[PDB]
């Protein structure tokens, strides 16, 4: 029996967990996914990995999930493990609502799922979830928020971050451009297209290849929308027109 | 059992010189109705101990198979050890109290006769776990009718021969048939001795109804 | 070897090595001798000290009024089997009011010791016992092993250098049946003496004796209570 | 790779034999059974002068009449010590009396080889305890000292030493022991042998000393009292 | 007496790839070819049912299976594993109907069935399924076609092929398939994609085909298959 | 329905002296208006130093005595010594209370010697409340035995009596007298009186006949 | 039963009766209703005798375990709270105990009342039992924090003795305790009837 | 359930799984705690925040109760569990007993939790060490620290994480009454010991202080930089 | 039988509870507090079964405190009241239900002053004023009579005075002392206890 045991929840001589760091490699081969925080909102921008002439397009999104009335997340890694975690995120958000009769604070929902993912790294003898998640939302305590989740079960709050393919190149690109305290949603949408264009593989960038959703506070209500193809088309072409005005 | 269905009345027991004798009528009553007038309420445990039982007959038949299996299991080992009349009495006491404490009792009153090591054994077991030893035993109505007879004879003559014990028992079955409404005139006699257990066939006590003419 | 890490792995020869490795634990323990007459059953064991400052280990243990044991192997496995034997004897007296026949108690050991030898993750009991008892069939000397197998014997010795004691008893096995109790213990002591090296002999500190029979209940003599048995000794010859 | 309940070709459990080796890394502890009491001594092994002196507790109280010295993995020990303290008070509740030093040691020895993987509880032990213990106390059989190791084997001792320098302290006790020793000489001997087998010099804050004698209860020695016994070097 | 393994048989390799899932993907890629086409007013599903011998009773077992009144299934890979997923999907369809009193949306069935497939990539003592499912359905007056795979991931298709020559089958469909087909035209291009990877001559016994529309899902009778084979 | 209890009668008495302890009881076992047996003593040997007397529901009495017997062995295998009179009394309290919500219909009185050799008597209720005292009666005729002992042994309600220490001879006669008086009035008391005397030498039993009606 | 406890300038005093009853018959008249947990912990018993003994002794066991683990002893507040939780575990099961917890700790003299229901209170004065009403009567009239030990002992005796006079289920002897900064001292064990005759003159 | 022994003894007598968890803490961020006369102060470092990240979320100083706070080093994911388990125990001790939790009890619980994870089936030990800071009800300041093995000690001043060997040695040289005299110099002692190992700059220091009776105070990046101004004023000068 | 009362104003919540700890026919305490501090601005007043009240009240108290430690901020008066409601409602159809009647008073930084009424059946209702106990039958009419949603703190204590005087005159039970506390922007303030 122990002959076939892979020993998933065990320590390495250096003091690290192998299955966790091997799961990190799975994220690197998945789609590029970025999140940017602004003054009047917060958004997610992700690379669509499911692209074909023969795909039907039935759902509103591919990688962007609505979890709460005031919260949404994006995913990078194994999609089936992502579906399990996002469904659990929707459950925990509803359990809090049932108990307190008010929406779950952003940080608390991230904390809850991270405790589940951490449990998979310590006991059970099972493989961890090979998924990294980006959470965006609004609560009455800290306002607009952005969070990053690791397969290790570790989290952090960011003003701008990225996970997936060419993630280290995307974050250093954001580190230079991001203007702390001055960022508006219109500036953050323009930055998202700029980072994706340089980061992505197919070069030219298309409305079928990217996926963007915005979270804003309007009339005392949190409005979450996945941007239409006609909107994305204008966002790509506005960067395309500024690419033509860069030479003299 | 919460409510007993088919019941058996008094079971007798008295020990003579060189053994013990037990009697019980072959009646299974459904309330007041005499349902089965030819059913055995006595069993042979092994060659040293025997058992007669009052109360619920279904519970008696259940205890009959459990004790029956225990003797079978012991005979398979063949290690020169067998259950003594005291050991059966001790087991039965523990069995009845255990069922009683679970509020699901075996509705039975037992008389256990036995002969081992030149000594005669007679033990009483209740459905609540009440157990003791006596020279003479009578359950149900026998405790009010037959037991006073047995005690008065045993006071004048403590030691009895097998013949003396038999005719005393037959005298008691006569009184039981006269005075118990839940009795019948068809009974068995079981006997333990140096030779073993011997259960005799359908017996009837001699009845006299001459007092039916003494009312004028 | 790779057929020797689990009890659930059979060797190509048709053996289980983990049972045989557990049998090695019995041989490493100090020697103990058991023998019987027509009336008595006597256990004689050799107490052992790791250092001269530390006291000697317990070898003889109580089970019931009519049954006693001597241990050889692991201490915790000995105490675990001892507590099972005590519990079975208690259950027998609680239910039947009569002492549990020795033959049946050893059979319960055989049934219990077998279970862990066939289940993965479990291990055999690293202790061998010599059981001395008295019942309706008279005195009994029984032997248990890490392998669930058990033996009914006239006399037996297990532990370190127990072969020397085994040969002594084999010569005098016809002597035991008509032996007086005092003569019976001396036979057990003389067998245990053969196990020791030539430099050292039986002392009042390293000898433990247990006796059960028709006369009395199981009794353990250790220090001052042992010297009457040792006194009146035929000298160590070669 | 093997299981935790695997026998060696020699006839021993690997995990137990390895737990004995874990003791050989722990600090040295010495107990001496005198006819008029039992004394326990241990080195604290200070790693830094920043660490609090009375913080390390390698000699603890189990009952009013029983003391226990520990060596090896301290974390494993305090789990066994708490169980020993529970046992004494469970026995006090049920029988209205103090337990014998032998029965307490036997109670701890029952947890010995209660470890395994399969056919076990969710909270069952995975491995043995890397601890050797010295139970020293006074009951109705006079002053007593007991030694216990991971194998479960427990035995009475007139004088015993366990730790890193076990053999060195054992031979020093071997030639300096009389079964008629006084309690004054008992503490003296344990202090004399302790400085010989240590890497550090004997200070009043460096070691723990305890006494259990027929008259008074188990006593933890205060710094001032240690200076009166170290005055006689 | 037995007690199962509690450790995962699918783990992350140093490359970051769950090897057992890709190995399970090799099982479907080597299985008999299957094709599904969404065609405006309905859905068609077709598979190779070549038993490779005349001894077999071609009528006994089926590869195109109904889940409910409006949903059907086809597979590429192992038959025994597929059966388990059919029985599980049939129960999930009834569990939904008992609670909501409404025919289960195809997207909701695939999500529930793909979640079962996910379990066998993480649970102890089990291997993943060696089957890729093709789920068709009709709800809200709209045709649906979905693919579920060993990974537990699901995709929505206009037209796709799986099994033997799945790469050549897809490229064929890229050129051949056009949106706004009629259902009867979809059966033709389904059999045509199946002919590209066949090897042998096609009879009504050699292939199995089911259709889904507003009237529900049903498997085409051997007589109906013969008429399209001309 | 079904009642798990039966009243079997019986009265138990214990008195403590300087170096002795007395446990006494009737030999009558009864049920309703009938007598089960005339030969049923309620006194029972536990150790050479301690004797128990059980009365009430005989089914409970038989099971409880067997539990104590087993627990006495369990103690001596674990502690290497016999269980003391005070320890048995402390143990019985916990065993009786473990059945707080389904109690033993039982009246226990323990009689023996303490560790100093002095006489000790422990009186219990069906649930497990106990204490040490000089003398106590328990059972169907306990209300008949008590007041005479309060007057004679306790010297209560008397003015100028010199308070003579209790002897074995006087206590033996006191034990006999109260039971003879109880057999005259209590219907459940009679047949024979068994007296168990606990001394440093051991247990000695004595039987005096009573009313058999 | 009758039980009282009150505190003043010089500490806490505890007084109880000694009578045990089954229906209308007297089982015992020597009954000890005070449990000496520790040199500075004290508990009184009212309600069901078996329920009081077992649980308060179990509290005593836990007080002992507390002293061994931390080596500092236990606060009165903590001790009373522990007992409360045990009764809370066994709710609706018909356990009957009324008790008071006396001690001296860092906060100072401590008095608590604990209930079978799980009621827990702290106060200057408490009385529990069938005759507590009578005890309260004499206690309230003639009580001041400004009392001398002799006067406090008078009040304790007085309260219990009068309670026993009026009450059927209270009688025997008065057992009085004094709680001092150092620890508790057992003042006396005086016969109630003799006291009552003395008071009659 | 998963029943495999994760942490086992090695031939030399080592618990590798515990030792690897101690390698995880040595890779962790630098954390130092020091007991003063009137106050106790923690200080954590190796922050290295990308300045694109909200640092309010990644704070390594956590309050367990009103009078107890802690700092950790190692696997930050593991810490969150232990912290929340200690926080639940804080309120449980408040429910079972009226009294608030003593600093030693919380440390003992965290230590017992870490110990249980080294001897239980199916689970690996925690990869964290903790520095526990608090006050007793009598007012005496207390500082403790735990490690993956389950051992705990009281400290005057201690450091855990990377550069712990360097910071610890600094505290041995700099721990006298001259540095503890005032409340300000004790906080300065933290910053000086901290800025001694870290990639220099006050921007990377988050430290917390708590007085004898006052609630926990997490200091402003303004207040700490004012003390960094007082250390460089007396660096080129002194 | 005990008494609770709450009066909510435009920017404050006034609450009062009796100080009697009664057993059968005796008053064991004159100064028993029936108020529980949940947060810096939340008070829970509990009434009902003897042992059930304190155990339940403290359990919620410790969980609201647990939330504060785990998050760095306190629960809102609404979230707190809904939490207590959830715990009581889940024990309703169990073997052991809690017979507790409670009153939650709080101040939110956004919503403002809040007062919540709750049954032993666990039915939650927000009220401008509420009272628990048999005394409510005598006082709710006085509250109905003189209450305006714009009542000042000076008038609120005077309105409470009118209610407590009614309990002295008409109510058969002896309730001489009352705990009075006000919750607002600054938190909980202990006010002079009303004695008769
Ligand atoms: Cl929501
Ligand atoms: Cl039973
Ligand atoms: Cl051995
Ligand atoms: Cl060792
Ligand atoms: Cl497993
Ligand atoms: Cl028991
Ligand atoms: Cl008294
Ligand atoms: K081989
Ligand atoms: K070993
Ligand atoms: K104590
Ligand atoms: K508190």
Tab-separated table of N, CA and C in Angstrom, chain A residues 96 98-102 105-108 111 115 139-142, chain I residues 67 70-71 73-76 78-80 82-83 86-87 108 110:
chain	number	residue	atom	x	y	z
A	96	UNK	N	-22.148	32.970	4.912
A	96	UNK	CA	-21.943	34.210	5.656
A	96	UNK	C	-23.193	35.086	5.594
A	98	UNK	N	-26.295	34.096	5.020
A	98	UNK	CA	-27.346	33.424	5.784
A	98	UNK	C	-27.236	33.707	7.284
A	99	UNK	N	-26.003	33.795	7.777
A	99	UNK	CA	-25.743	33.954	9.205
A	99	UNK	C	-25.842	35.404	9.684
A	100	UNK	N	-25.187	36.317	8.970
A	100	UNK	CA	-25.087	37.717	9.397
A	100	UNK	C	-26.061	38.658	8.685
A	101	UNK	N	-26.635	38.186	7.578
A	101	UNK	CA	-27.557	38.966	6.733
A	101	UNK	C	-26.933	40.238	6.146
A	102	UNK	N	-25.652	40.133	5.795
A	102	UNK	CA	-24.927	41.171	5.057
A	102	UNK	C	-23.758	40.537	4.291
A	105	UNK	N	-17.210	40.337	3.738
A	105	UNK	CA	-16.045	41.174	3.444
A	105	UNK	C	-15.041	40.451	2.548
A	106	UNK	N	-14.453	41.193	1.611
A	106	UNK	CA	-13.590	40.631	0.568
A	106	UNK	C	-12.479	39.721	1.087
A	107	UNK	N	-11.745	40.203	2.089
A	107	UNK	CA	-10.605	39.481	2.652
A	107	UNK	C	-11.015	38.156	3.296
A	108	UNK	N	-12.179	38.150	3.945
A	108	UNK	CA	-12.676	36.975	4.666
A	108	UNK	C	-13.002	35.794	3.752
A	111	UNK	N	-9.720	34.324	2.640
A	111	UNK	CA	-9.176	33.621	3.803
A	111	UNK	C	-9.771	32.217	3.949
A	115	UNK	N	-7.735	28.539	3.509
A	115	UNK	CA	-7.664	27.564	4.598
A	115	UNK	C	-7.974	26.147	4.111
A	139	UNK	N	-16.338	45.927	-0.274
A	139	UNK	CA	-17.047	45.811	1.001
A	139	UNK	C	-17.131	47.167	1.699
A	140	UNK	N	-17.921	47.237	2.768
A	140	UNK	CA	-18.148	48.494	3.488
A	140	UNK	C	-16.988	48.904	4.406
A	141	UNK	N	-15.937	48.085	4.448
A	141	UNK	CA	-14.798	48.329	5.333
A	141	UNK	C	-13.612	48.940	4.634
A	142	UNK	N	-13.161	48.306	3.552
A	142	UNK	CA	-11.950	48.742	2.852
A	142	UNK	C	-12.188	49.199	1.409
I	67	UNK	N	-14.739	37.357	16.463
I	67	UNK	CA	-14.820	38.045	15.176
I	67	UNK	C	-13.928	39.286	15.155
I	70	UNK	N	-10.224	38.123	14.869
I	70	UNK	CA	-9.922	37.495	13.582
I	70	UNK	C	-9.932	38.467	12.400
I	71	UNK	N	-10.522	39.645	12.588
I	71	UNK	CA	-10.710	40.589	11.483
I	71	UNK	C	-10.185	42.006	11.725
I	73	UNK	N	-11.793	44.388	13.197
I	73	UNK	CA	-12.946	45.269	13.371
I	73	UNK	C	-14.137	44.515	13.960
I	74	UNK	N	-15.059	45.257	14.567
I	74	UNK	CA	-16.197	44.669	15.273
I	74	UNK	C	-17.411	44.479	14.364
I	75	UNK	N	-18.294	43.560	14.752
I	75	UNK	CA	-19.547	43.323	14.037
I	75	UNK	C	-20.497	44.505	14.178
I	76	UNK	N	-21.254	44.774	13.117
I	76	UNK	CA	-22.303	45.790	13.146
I	76	UNK	C	-23.486	45.295	13.986
I	78	UNK	N	-26.512	45.077	13.464
I	78	UNK	CA	-27.394	44.234	12.658
I	78	UNK	C	-26.823	42.824	12.484
I	79	UNK	N	-25.546	42.742	12.107
I	79	UNK	CA	-24.863	41.460	11.916
I	79	UNK	C	-24.749	40.674	13.220
I	80	UNK	N	-24.577	41.396	14.327
I	80	UNK	CA	-24.527	40.792	15.655
I	80	UNK	C	-25.881	40.197	16.037
I	82	UNK	N	-28.385	39.347	14.047
I	82	UNK	CA	-28.694	38.238	13.146
I	82	UNK	C	-27.898	36.976	13.470
I	83	UNK	N	-26.723	37.160	14.071
I	83	UNK	CA	-25.900	36.043	14.528
I	83	UNK	C	-26.522	35.365	15.749
I	86	UNK	N	-29.587	33.424	14.633
I	86	UNK	CA	-29.248	32.174	13.958
I	86	UNK	C	-28.959	31.051	14.953
I	87	UNK	N	-28.191	31.365	15.994
I	87	UNK	CA	-27.816	30.385	17.011
I	87	UNK	C	-28.994	29.874	17.838
I	108	UNK	N	-24.180	51.881	15.206
I	108	UNK	CA	-23.402	51.703	13.986
I	108	UNK	C	-22.880	53.055	13.513
I	110	UNK	N	-22.478	53.873	10.467
I	110	UNK	CA	-23.191	54.196	9.230
I	110	UNK	C	-24.679	54.302	9.422
